[PDB]
């Protein structure tokens, strides 16, 4: 139930309810789509 707004940072997808969170940078930091 974390049905999160903008594509914040994450570690794991299921963060979001939308769990398709990418890390497609230097830091693991992971936004959430």
Do not use: A, F, V, W
Not at 6 to 20: I, T
């Amino acid at each position: 139930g974390d049905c999160l707004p903008h594509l914040k940072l994450c570690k794991e997808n299921k963060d979001c309810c939308s769990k398709k969170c990418k890390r497609r940078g230097t830091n693991i930091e992971k936004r959430c789509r």
